[PDB]
Design a protein around this ligand. Structure first.
Ligand SMILES: Nc1ncnc2c1ncn2[C@@H]1O[C@H](COP(=O)(O)OP(=O)(O)O)[C@@H](O)[C@H]1O
Ligand SMILES: Nc1ncnc2c1ncn2[C@@H]1O[C@H](COP(=O)(O)OP(=O)(O)O)[C@@H](O)[C@H]1O
Ligand SMILES: [Mg+2]
Ligand SMILES: [Mg+2]
Ligand SMILES: [Mg+2]
Lengths: 148, 720, 371, 371, 371
């Protein structure tokens, strides 16, 4: 889409893919496409991953090759959400404009709204989103941490 | 605030001006029922608060709630009593002007209990908790006295408040509590003489005669049976109280001691109360030109000690009208009517002045111990008016005529201040005023006040006109003079359908709280307060310390005739109105949901009456204005810009311009909204409902963006 | 201020105040005194005229005059000084604020009402005014709307019968005999003892005797025979210079004139027969209630025993089954004014005033259409 | 409610109530009084007119008019006030709930029923009404299907023969003389002793003599010679103001006008000959049953001696064989009421009313056809 | 001598003479004056009482008493002095020669006729007497057998309808209103300009104002608005000391009382209504002949404009086809005299007199039968 992806980017992609090839598996699971892309620091949604997978999952076998992973990465590589956009996606929930949200209200929005976190992913999120260790996420600093 | 608007099914709205069908009294009552059974009982109407008595120990008045509400503006956070409490304190600190809460309701709606919760909130929140605690303690410990002297059993409640009680907490330039005040307006003193069937006189008489300490009663012309005294028996209701007079007398005696009444003041006070019984038992008989004479010494042999006046003087004072003209005094004798009125007026005057002294003794006790004088920078007060509601029974009489006029005037203030507050915000935001029709009470306060045509100015003529005058002749003068006024009706003036519901000897007024019918029997009896200078001269010559403080030589200089109870009430009220007009008062209105004192019983018949007795439909119409909602452009744009990509995540024009493209994106029609100087305006709250509903579906995308960012961060933390 | 002025122009005392008062605020003798002698001392502060108690304190050096003859204003130039003194000195109010209720006796000239009205609107600029018959106001003060009033002022006595608040204007009787006519008779009587009084100031000495010592005989021929044969009816009074007066049959031979006006040489019958003749001119049904509601007012009705005499006399003239009662209360001197206190306070009276607008539309002729 | 109103508009007393009552709930004089003088006291609750007992109380200040001339309504605006007072003040009912039975004397002017009818529909809105002949009601009160009724009211005397429920319309007699014509005669005859009565207020005092002292002579020339020669027949009456009247032959010269109408200058023979002529205009078969059943009613038949005089007179005109009786019951003043109460209570009457449905079709012409 | 005396005792003027005179010989006021003041000079010789012209000259010192109240002799001892003065001082004849025709108003007391009879026999010793109704005599002076006589004296007004010599005694009207009550009302009305009159000697002044200046308005409101806006109706009259009265609408407000007795507070109808109400009690065929012959007599019918007013007034009340005429000749003050002169001259009357023989048998009761 935005670029003809090339050796300079492919070197990082193949280094990351080697953690999921691991001992010699050679190919990555259809949803694990998102896992390698997220280890490369992309923010693909589960719906975006499914919409790309619908055009390579033509005959099953649950898995994809490096060239078609590179081809689907070449779809996602156009744009990504900004620090201010992600900060404002938290700021809508702020009680005053005070810079903090409760870990329970974060757990609510992460599990009552579409593309839900698992309870394991919420507990792992709160493990460092509770920056002060008191049950309040400073969402401005947590977004500056998370969008780095 | 908007945060409630997803729960329009489960809870209902937070502030009834946001109701779409706002003219539906049924939908308003239904939203009250929904919040009541959900226990989310408090609701606004703009700046006003509405409540319903939960009959339960709800934890909403707890210290954690006080510290939640402290410092938070009333519209950004959900309704509770402490939101108005904090808002009045912030206004008091910010504007430096004094401010007042006004409580109003049917008795048993929680007026006293809400006043106690307001005072506890101030005592625990405000900077000096010891001095605030002492003021709170005395303000609330005063209550048994002001009840025994000021409450009565009516047809509807056993301990109703027959007076417009008022209080202040005094506050310094720093924001700490300093002291306090008590004032009592509008005491129903007609009751001291006369009661209707099923009603008691003021509680102190029954508490005294039931209370025991018979050797303390032995100085009096005592009778343990209250049927013995002509001022206690007329209502036929002495014994049939559900509440135990003996037990309450001991509470009130203990309270007088805790209030720093000396044993001499208590003994004087009990002597005055006992004297008011002996004033009642006086029987008059006629002589040659129908002039009256006191028939027996059996009353006077007590009155002379109890009121501390010479019997040869009091016998003369009760039966002679003194004039002083060209410096010669002229004792003119009274007929049997005028002697009865002079006695009964003396009982009203003795009692209501003693009650005013029971207030003044506390009002001098609550005041500042510090000098309250320069270099003291500024003095301020936080008011708590606790007035009686609008009042209807099977047979409304002179008492309820005055109470309901008082409430008509309190409504005629409350609507005026609220209407002007809306108009002045409209003009401040540069909005052209939307023309609106509402029941302007100034049309009908004129029917009760107007200098030489209102009902008070005619009822004061029928006390004064020579010859035979009767309650029916008064009614026949109303029908001859107010006749065309569209708020007034009588059995004569009524059409052949409405005349079935309204009798001979009655007239009817279209008050704000709907139409009420008045029975004229006892209007000319009750309006007369003939207390000629001779009785005041007599009584301020008393040996008794209470009587010596309560009547003084300065009044004896005034050449005016005695003023009638309707005029004394009119003047006392007009002072309370101009006292409140001096402030920007916050209103609390309370609903009693059932007579059973039962949790969860919403009795819609009793509530549909009170929703009319508290004027909530006029207020809802006025505060609903042309526009149901308005907001600062910045706060509105920050909440809702995610719905308009041109403003997302941040906007670079005026906030007004960002809101303008946002309402184009949301597709609002030119009639559904307006743009003010710094606020959005909305004409139909369905627009705002759909806008929070739109934000609620937008939150799905916001969470998906956050979840995707978290997963794209997580896989860089545990790997690569 | 907005209160109605009320101003009973007594022929002997001015009596004024505001509607709402019990008593008048201003009471003073209805006199304008003027200096009788050369001004000897320069810078002494002599006025060319004095009013009320300013005049009565200076008796010896002034020619006293009353501007009212028999309830008729007879000198207007002095009467403007009376009303000016009333409003400016005694009441301390500006008449431009206050609607004004004046009074007069019945059967008076029409020139009197017209010129009172012209003066109130053109000299004092009042917002509105009204004129009331004095004996009618006396029923309001009495608290009654059926009865017959006998009002004896200073220059005139009049009788008005009223039933259910209707005056019977053909049964009104006016008798030009009251306290000033009795005073000038007492001045004549006292010369029989050798005490001589003739100056305008000495009338006020003999009026002050009359207010203290004179009384009405329950049976005149018997009192006269008792005074002619014993000293027990004699009393003494000290003149302003310290001389001692002593008087006897002269104490009741003075007030008896009301029952016997031929002592002045008048023809018209006594105040008993004049009260009876007006009852006996009323329509037969009301007379039973006029006898139960006879009313007396004005200061000439104040003598000890006058009501007991009056009851004894009308009990002779009326049929023997009628329960005749004569209301004559301890304040009766001020009752015509106390009626004006009430009337100008009534709410349904506030349509009744002549406004200055209705004066400008019709001149002083307006009064007769309203009053 | 649903009970029938009954309303005997007497020529001098209105008598009203409901069917099934024993006696009228309202009885008050058929008078409207209006005030004769200047109302002097302000705000008094004085009225442009007073009705019935109010006007009978305030006599001395009211011109007491009667709206009925000889049983004929002669002033309709006053008669509307009389019905308004009847319904709204005395009975305290809304006429729309109550079918209303009126009455009139026979031979009346043709429009008196029509205008009575029009006022009941087009002003009081009654559901239905009827207009009985007064003397027929007096037979219903007597409990008899046969009799001759002598009714004398305040304004009219009329005489209806009925045989077994057939009223004989040719034999009815009417005489425009009853208790008012006797009052206005006694007002004239009392001037012989000296007592003068002439106002409409005093007429009610001469009626109150007439009701209390007068009686019928069993033989007039014998009583007339007795009174001219002895004081034995005199009685005394005390006027409202306690004057005492005493009267003698005036006690029976007043009722005697019924038996000798020439004292008023009348052409027609008296109430004995009028009863004879109405018996004698019936055909010969029934007369024995009319002579056995002379029903009296109405308040002018109340005098002592009148039934004995009537029985003496008619026996001298009749054949000597006849068993004559006179049915003068103690209550005969109210028999026209008791009959109206009986009539409107009957089951067989309830179809014979005139409904507003029939008035809306036929107009006021309907009473000439239904009654 | 053998001529009959005729002696019309006015309620105000005695008018006396002999039958066959054209006019009364003695006309003098019916007054007895008794001196009010203490005796003037020794040897002057004041009389204890004065009658007629003596009292009318000596007014200033006298209490003037009229012995006749509305045609009724109210003091008898004064009346004996007035008859004695008439016969002995004015006519100068011995009554024992002369049969004496007296008069009185209709509907009068019977005690009046009895005591006039007793005095003519048991004090004047006349041979015979008769006691005529005044209005009847007025027809002889008028030369008519048919007419309705409106007579207004000093003290009473009465209407008597007579048809072909038959008097109709049911249709007589007596009104206690005449020239005396018009003089007392003019006394009251004059106070409005300021002139006060109160003695009986001053009522005789006001009587001369009533005779000289007063006139009946042809239309009351038109004259009233004319006098209220223009000076041409005002006239000046000079009192008996040179003080000058001027009066305007007081010239016709006094006479208008006759058409509006409500000015006296009197309820009874005006003299135009009372002349119609008697015609309306006459039988139908003769009303046409009464409208053609309304006769006026007595001094109170003398005013300028009263005939024109009265013809206008009955023309509004009567059917418009009737020819209303009024007979009011120049001599109408004396028509009751000229009447008594003709009646006592009739040969057919000479059997009518009550002789002392009939009085010796019947006592004073004889005038109930003969008159
Ligand atoms: N005791 C009585 N003796 C004679 N007349 C009487 C008596 N009681 C009442 N009346 C007369 O009865 C008349 C009223 O009779 P009533 O039938 O009621 O008349 P009406 O029906 O026409 O109104 C009056 O004239 C009244 O004075
Ligand atoms: N010209 C006149 N104009 C008006 N009134 C007159 C006139 N002449 C006489 N009178 C009045 O007529 C009355 C006398 O009436 P008269 O018949 O002569 O006396 P009396 O009735 O006593 O017989 C008096 O009141 C008198 O003032
Ligand atoms: Mg006086
Ligand atoms: Mg009848
Ligand atoms: Mg004459």
């Amino acid at each position: 889409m935005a670029d003809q992806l090339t050796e300079e980017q492919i070197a990082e992609f193949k280094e990351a893919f080697s953690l999921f090839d691991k001992d010699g598996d050679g190919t990555i699971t259809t949803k694990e496409l998102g896992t390698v892309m997220r280890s490369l620091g992309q923010n693909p949604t589960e719906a975006e991953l499914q919409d790309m997978i619908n055009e390579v999952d033509a005959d099953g076998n649950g898995t994809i090759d490096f060239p078609e992973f590179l081809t689907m990465m070449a779809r996602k590589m156009k744009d990504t959400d900004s620090e201010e956009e992600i900060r404002e996606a938290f700021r809508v929930f702020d009680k005053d404009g005070n810079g903090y949200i409760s870990a329970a209200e974060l757990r609510h929005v992460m599990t009552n709204l579409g593309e839900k976190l698992t309870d394991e992913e919420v507990d792992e999120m709160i493990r460092e989103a509770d920056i002060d260790g008191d049950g309040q996420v400073n969402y401005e600093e947590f977004v500056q941490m998370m969008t780095a | 605030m908007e945060s409630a608007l997803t729960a329009r099914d489960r809870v209902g709205v937070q502030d009834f001006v946001l109701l779409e069908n706002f003219t539906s009294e049924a939908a308003f009552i239904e939203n009250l029922r929904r919040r009541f059974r959900e226990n989310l009982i408090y609701t606004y109407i703009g700046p006003v608060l509405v409540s319903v008595n939960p009959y339960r120990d709800l934890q909403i008045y707890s210290r954690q709630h006080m510290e939640r509400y402290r410092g938070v503006s009333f519209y950004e956070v959900p309704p509770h009593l402490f939101a108005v409490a904090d808002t009045v304190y912030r206004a008091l600190r910010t504007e430096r002007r004094d401010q007042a809460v006004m409580i109003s309701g049917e008795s048993g709606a929680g007026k006293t209990e809400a006043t106690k919760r307001l005072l506890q909130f101030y005592a625990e929140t405000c900077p000096a908790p010891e001095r605030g605690g002492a003021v709170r303690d005395r303000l609330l410990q005063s209550n048994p006295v002001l009840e025994a002297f000021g409450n009565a059993k009516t047809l509807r409640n056993d301990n109703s408040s027959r007076f417009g009680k008022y209080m202040d907490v005094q506050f310094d330039f720093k924001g700490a509590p300093v002291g306090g005040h008590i004032l009592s307006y509008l005491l129903e003193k007609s009751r001291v003489v006369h009661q209707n069937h099923g009603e008691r006189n003021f509680h102190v008489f029954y508490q005294l005669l039931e209370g025991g300490e018979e050797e303390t009663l032995r100085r009096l012309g005592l009778e343990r049976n209250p049927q013995s005294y002509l001022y206690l028996v007329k209502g036929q209701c002495a014994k049939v109280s559900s509440i135990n007079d003996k037990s309450d007398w001991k509470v009130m005696r203990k309270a007088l001691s805790v209030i720093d009444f000396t044993e001499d003041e208590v003994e004087d006070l009990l002597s005055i109360v006992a004297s008011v019984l002996h004033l009642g038992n006086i029987h008059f008989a006629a002589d040659e030109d129908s002039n009256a004479q006191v028939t027996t010494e059996n009353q006077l042999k007590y009155l002379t000690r109890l009121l501390g006046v010479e019997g040869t003087t009091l016998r003369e004072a009760l039966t002679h009208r003194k004039i002083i003209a060209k410096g010669e005094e002229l004792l003119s004798p009274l007929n049997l009517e005028q002697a009865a009125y002079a006695r009964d007026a003396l009982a009203k005057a003795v009692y209501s002045r003693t009650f005013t002294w029971l207030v003044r003794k506390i009002n001098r006790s609550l005041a500042s111990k510090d000098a309250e004088s320069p270099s003291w920078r500024s003095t301020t007060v936080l008011g708590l008016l606790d007035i009686y509601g609008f009042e209807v029974f099977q047979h409304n009489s002179f008492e309820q005529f005055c109470i309901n006029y008082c409430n008509e005037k309190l409504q005629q203030l409350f609507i005026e201040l609220t209407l002007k507050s809306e108009q002045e915000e409209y003009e401040a935001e540069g909005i052209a005023w939307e023309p609106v029709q509402y029941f302007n009470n100034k049309i009908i306060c004129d029917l009760v006040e107007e200098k030489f045509k209102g009902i008070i100015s005619i009822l004061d003529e029928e006390c004064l006109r020579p010859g035979e005058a009767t309650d029916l002749t008064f009614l026949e003068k109303l029908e001859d003079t107010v006749k065309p006024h569209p708020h007034f009706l009588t059995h004569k003036l009524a059409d052949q359908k409405t005349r079935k519901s309204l009798d001979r000897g009655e007239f009817r007024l279209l008050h704000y709280a709907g139409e009420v019918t008045y029975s004229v029997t006892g209007f000319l009896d009750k309006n007369n307060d003939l207390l000629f200078r001779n009785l005041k001269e007599t009584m301020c010559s008393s040996m008794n310390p209470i009587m010596a403080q309560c009547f003084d030589k300065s009044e004896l200089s005034d050449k005016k005739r005695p003023e009638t109870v309707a005029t004394q009430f009119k003047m006392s009220l007009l002072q309370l109105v101009e006292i409140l007009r001096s402030k920007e008062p916050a209103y609390i209105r309370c609903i009693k949901p059932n007579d059973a004192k039962q949790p969860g019983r919403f009795d819609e018949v009793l509530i549909r009456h009170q929703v009319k007795y508290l004027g909530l439909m006029e207020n809802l119409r006025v505060r609903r204005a042309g526009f149901a909602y308005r907001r600062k452009y910045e706060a509105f744009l920050q909440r809702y810009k995610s719905l308009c990509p041109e403003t997302w995540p941040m906007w670079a024009g005026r906030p007004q311009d960002g809101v303008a493209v946002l309402v184009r994106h949301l597709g609002y029609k030119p009639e559904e909204y307006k743009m003010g100087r710094t606020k959005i305006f909305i004409r139909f709250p369905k627009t705002l409902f759909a806008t929070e509903d739109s934000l609620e579906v937008r939150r799905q995308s916001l969470a998906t963006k956050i979840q995707a960012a978290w997963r794209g961060f997580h896989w860089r933390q545990k790997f690569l | 201020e907005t209160t109605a002025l009320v101003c009973d122009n007594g022929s002997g005392l001015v009596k004024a105040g505001f509607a709402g008062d019990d008593a008048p605020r201003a009471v003073f003798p209805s006199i304008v005194g003027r200096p009788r002698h050369q001004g000897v001392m320069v810078g002494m502060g002599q006025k060319d005229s004095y009013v009320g108690d300013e005049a009565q304190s200076k008796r010896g050096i002034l020619t006293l005059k009353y501007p009212i003859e028999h309830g008729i204003i007879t000198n207007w130039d002095d009467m403007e000084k009376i009303w000016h003194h009333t409003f400016y000195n005694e009441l301390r109010v500006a008449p431009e604020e206050h609607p004004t209720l004046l009074t007069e006796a019945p059967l008076n000239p029409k020139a009197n009402r017209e010129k009172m009205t012209q003066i109130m609107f053109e000299t004092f600029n009042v917002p509105a005014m009204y004129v009331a018959i004095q004996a009618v106001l006396s029923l309001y003060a009495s608290g009654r709307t059926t009865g017959i009033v006998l009002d004896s002022g200073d220059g005139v006595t009049h009788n008005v019968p009223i039933y259910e608040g209707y005056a019977l204007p053909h049964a009104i009787m006016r008798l030009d005999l009251a306290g000033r006519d009795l005073t000038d008779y007492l001045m004549k009587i006292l010369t029989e003892r050798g005490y001589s009084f003739v100056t305008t100031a000495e009338r006020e000495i003999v009026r002050d005797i009359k207010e203290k010592l004179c009384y009405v005989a329950l049976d005149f021929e018997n009192e006269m025979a008792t005074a002619a044969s014993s000293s027990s009816l004699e009393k003494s009074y000290e003149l302003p210079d310290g001389q001692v007066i002593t008087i006897g049959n002269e104490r009741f031979r003075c007030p008896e004139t009301l029952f016997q006006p031929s002592f002045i040489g008048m023809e018209s019958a006594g105040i008993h027969e004049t009260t009876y003749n007006s009852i006996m001119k009323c329509d037969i049904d009301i007379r039973k209630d006029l006898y139960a509601n006879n009313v007396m007012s004005g200061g000439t009705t104040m003598y000890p025993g006058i009501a007991d005499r009056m009851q004894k006399e009308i009990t002779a003239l009326a049929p023997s089954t009628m329960k005749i009662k004569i209301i004559a209360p301890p304040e009766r001197k001020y009752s015509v004014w106390i009626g004006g206190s009430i009337l100008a306070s009534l709410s349904t009276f506030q349509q009744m005033w002549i406004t200055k607008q209705e004066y400008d539309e019709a001149g002083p002729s307006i009064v007769h259409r309203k009053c």
